Design a protein around this ligand. Structure first.
Ligand code: FAD
Ligand code: PM7
Ligand code: PM7
Ligand code: CL
Ligand code: ZN
Length: 664
């Protein structure tokens, strides 16, 4: 496909603002429709996942308008995504060769556990991702992911309006046939607000809970909560001076210690690029995805920047997520002038390994505009008690949220977005096909499982978060209990069977494994013990021994009962095939490599000979995956065959669950 510069030229020809060039790509036009079936408040990642999944699940049925107050896709924290998210992107027609032009490659979740009382001592937990011919995971810059999903939505009959705000004071939501009158303005100053007559409102306003807060007070869990403070840094090409053995920049790296943990995410940034130019680049990438352009014939990320006049740079996202019962000294003025800056730099110098690690990185000033060198957010975890009602439902952060750890926010949260999308078709049809009282009653019944799922989802994720946090107080419990149980319970069994039709049903059965009974049994034993030890104390060695022995005894039976075949010793560097801990084990599969030219991490596969980020040619043999233990040519061929394309929808197929087999 020859690249077109439609939006760059349209914007210049009409001196269009950012919101106007974006809204000009809507199927029904740049102005709001008088009426719609569904109105989505908020075009964060979940409002757009919802709208894309709804139109894809059943096209040409619902008229959907998404209202976003930002003039263009705004900055969001929340950058690490997981295989279920990639699978969803692939099911929606965008596979890894195209996503990797926009986003960073992610291969594995890796953990380093720092000993607080013995500074310099650490242990680790290493996992891998998948071969390039199986799948990829992604580190996403959220202004870019939200642009990608906006453009894809506009190409699939969804209208997205940036620079427009739902007025939750004058908006009317009710359970009639189309009882909703959604008031949309450009802001509080706006003299001339518009109204969209509609049947269903979707609250996708994230943690702001702009609608559902009207129906119930925000709920907090017992015990400590967390605070986060973070910034953006350079991304070194040469990672060899990182003070952790066997470190890899394309993993989502976790530096873990008694008070909490640090995330480390390497990802490309498009900041500084005009929005219209970005629309042309994204549009071009979708046309290439439609045409099936091979990876080696697709322009590299840097070449796309040259073609469309973009800014491109590699950054590392680095942040603290710590407990809010941490004691800080009163005067922190030595570590900066902002609180976020102060607590970040104060915490770095509490751990020699964190200071040696951070000395590989240079702080980036104001990457997302003024005031954005440093971020802080306090009291992270919450739940919305009411997530649906006559004429409306809520999705994503609007339902609740826990913690960055294991990235439930996007990858678990999309279970609500995609289920709500599927449920939206009968909700709207019920209201168009039955009198008001019976329609309302039938819809309420239909949503009882949605309400019940949300109600128990967040507490399960909250217990999962505490489970990991308390085990991060010890360098054996963290890797051998908490991480082990999260990967065994939460690995995505039978993901290669998921299609558009089964996606929501599969996704709500996953929950990162946090519903698995044996997982909850080990988690409750650890939390019950460790929470009785004050944070500023070391765990007694006998408590670690006992929790470790308890966890391993429950583990052996639960692993024996799993009928899913997995080369566990290839995926977890520290464990054998039966998930026994192996002191000093170093062998694992190798799926990625670092470009010698630009430093970008690449997926190994024979048809990708050039770096997807800068275009530099690898010598060819580098593209050979290392399977350890080995796979024959037949086994390797069989693996890739399973992951080529998703199975067609069979309404007589039983859904195979991601969680381990029950013990009968
Ligand atoms: C420190 C931290 C780290 C995290 N790391 C990760 C991670 O690595 N991986 C992960 O998956 N998750 C992570 N999360 C969670 C993740 O950030 C969220 O789950 C995710 O962004 C939720 O997206 P959303 O679409 O629900 O809401 P948001 O992305 O917050 O979008 C809400 C939207 O609503 C719009 N809006 C608000 N009011 C109005 C109105 N009146 N009219 C119109 N529009 C409106 C806003 O402009 C905004 O765009 C992290 C969270 C935190 C706090
Ligand atoms: C299931 C999968 C998405 C996964 N989910 C994880 C969670 C935590 C840590 C590691 C993983 C992995 C690695 C896996 C294991 N599978 C072996 C055959 C196909 C596949 C898919 C992939 C593979 O190639 N790598
Ligand atoms: C299992 C089932 C009760 C179910 N449980 C859910 C939970 C959340 C969201 C959706 C579902 C569904 C829809 C299902 C999926 N199954 C495919 C084969 C038979 C069946 C039974 C039924 C079917 O026809 N529809
Ligand atoms: Cl993650
Ligand atoms: Zn390169």
């Amino acid at each position: 496909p020859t690249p077109k510069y439609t939006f760059t030229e349209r914007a210049a020809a009409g001196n269009l603002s950012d919101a106007e060039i974006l809204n000009s790509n809507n199927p029904t036009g740049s102005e709001l429709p008088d009426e719609s079936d569904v109105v989505v408040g908020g075009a964060g990642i979940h409002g757009l996942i919802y709208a894309l999944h709804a139109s894809k699940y059943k096209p040409n049925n619902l008229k959907i308008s998404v209202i976003e107050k930002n003039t263009r896709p705004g900055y969001k924290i929340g950058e690490s995504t997981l295989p279920i998210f990639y699978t969803w992107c692939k099911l929606h027609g965008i596979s890894a060769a195209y996503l990797l032009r926009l986003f960073g490659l992610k291969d594995g979740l890796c953990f380093y556990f720092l000993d607080r009382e013995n500074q310099g001592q650490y242990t680790d937990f290493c996992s891998v991702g998948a071969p390039g011919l199986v799948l990829a995971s992604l580190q996403i810059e959220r202004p870019m992911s939200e642009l990608l999903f906006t453009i894809l939505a506009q190409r699939n009959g969804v209208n997205v309006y940036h620079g427009r705000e739902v007025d939750f004071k004058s908006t009317v939501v009710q359970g009639g046939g189309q009882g909703n009158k959604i008031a949309v303005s450009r802001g509080k100053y706006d003299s001339t607000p518009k109204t969209i007559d509609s049947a269903l409102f979707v609250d996708a306003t994230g943690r702001f809970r702009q609608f559902c807060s009207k129906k119930a007070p925000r709920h907090r869990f017992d015990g400590w909560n967390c605070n986060a403070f973070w910034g953006y840094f350079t991304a070194p090409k040469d990672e060899s001076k990182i003070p952790f053995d066997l470190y890899e920049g394309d993993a989502t790296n976790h530096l873990c210690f008694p008070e909490g943990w640090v995330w480390v995410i390497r990802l490309p940034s498009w900041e500084g690029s005009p929005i219209a130019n970005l629309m042309d680049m994204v549009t071009y990438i979708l046309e290439c995805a439609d045409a099936g352009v091979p990876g080696d014939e697709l322009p590299s990320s840097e070449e796309l920047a040259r073609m469309f006049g973009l800014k491109f740079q590699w950054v590392t996202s680095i942040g603290f997520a710590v407990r809010n019962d941490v004691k800080y000294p009163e005067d922190l003025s030595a570590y900066g002038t902002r609180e976020a800056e102060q607590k970040f730099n104060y915490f770095v110098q509490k751990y020699e390994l964190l200071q040696q690690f951070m000395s590989n990185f240079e702080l980036i000033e104001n990457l997302y505009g003024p005031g954005t060198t440093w971020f802080i957010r306090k009291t992270l975890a919450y739940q919305s008690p009411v997530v649906s009602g006559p004429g409306w439902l809520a999705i994503g952060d609007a339902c609740g949220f826990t913690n960055p750890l294991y990235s439930p926010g996007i990858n678990v949260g999309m279970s609500t977005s995609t289920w709500a999308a599927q449920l939206s078709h009968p909700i709207v049809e019920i209201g168009k096909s039955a009198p008001a009282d019976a329609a309302e009653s039938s819809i309420r019944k239909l949503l009882v499982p949605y309400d019940d799922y949300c109600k128990s989802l967040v507490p399960a994720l909250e217990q999962m978060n505490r489970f990991n946090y308390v085990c991060y107080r010890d360098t054996r419990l963290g890797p051998q209990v908490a991480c082990l149980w999260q990967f065994f319970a939460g690995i995505e069994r039978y993901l290669s069977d998921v299609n558009i039709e089964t996606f929501a049903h599969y996704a709500i059965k996953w929950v990162w494994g946090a519903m698995v009974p044996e997982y909850q049994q080990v988690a409750q034993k650890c939390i019950e013990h460790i929470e009785t030890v004050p944070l500023d104390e070391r765990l007694p060695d006998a408590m670690v021994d006992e929790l470790l022995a308890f966890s391993n005894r429950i583990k052996s039976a639960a692993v024996a009962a799993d009928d899913f075949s997995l080369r566990w010793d290839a995926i977890l560097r520290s464990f054998d095939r039966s998930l026994n801990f192996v002191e000093g084990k170093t062998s694992r599969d190798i799926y990625t490599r670092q470009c010698s030219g630009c430093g970008a991490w690449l997926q190994l596969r024979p048809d990708w000979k050039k770096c997807h980020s800068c275009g530099l040619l690898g010598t060819e043999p580098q593209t050979a995956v290392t399977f350890d233990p080995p796979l024959t040519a037949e086994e390797e061929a069989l693996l890739y065959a399973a992951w080529n394309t998703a199975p067609k929808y069979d309404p007589s197929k039983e859904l195979k669950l991601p969680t381990p087999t029950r013990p009968a």
